[PDB]
């Protein structure tokens with residue numbers, strides 16, 4: 001519901017959701033988007 | 049730049065590239081293979 005949305009807000013108001021109390025399997029994050037930039041800084045995307 | 053040898057009227061599509069791999073490519077590895085990337089949980093073998 002952060003990748004299935006319809007009105008990702010403009011950058012002047014960057015919508016900020018909070019994700020807590022959950023199990024984060026980023027494989028679904030890998031399915032809703034044919035990526036163009038997965039640049040991760042603090043963590044390695046393979047080890048997430 | 050070489051738009052004189054990779055171009056013609058009515059177009060050309062000889063070249064190819066891979067957006068869909070089961071994992072990353074380790075340094076200096078070729079992965080020439082035509083396998084349909086899985087989605088969901090289907091053993092699907094076909095386009096669409």
Ligand SMILES: *[C@@H]1O[C@H](CO)[C@@H](O[C@@H]2O[C@H](CO)[C@@H](O)[C@H](O)[C@@H]2O)[C@H](O)[C@H]1NC(C)=O
Nearest residue numbers: 001002004005006007008009014015016017
């Ligand atoms: C950012 O956009 C998200 C997706 O539209 C919002 O999440 C949902 O918002 C709906 C209301 O539009 C809620 O009913 C739902 O429970 C879920 O929270 C999110 O609220 C929004 N955040 C901000 C700060 O605008």
Ligand SMILES: *[C@@H]1O[C@H](CO)[C@@H](O)[C@H](O)[C@H]1NC(C)=O
Nearest residue numbers: 001002003004005031032033
């Ligand atoms: C958004 O949700 C609809 C609901 O059926 C789904 O079909 C679609 O694939 C989703 N798209 C993204 C980008 O999440």
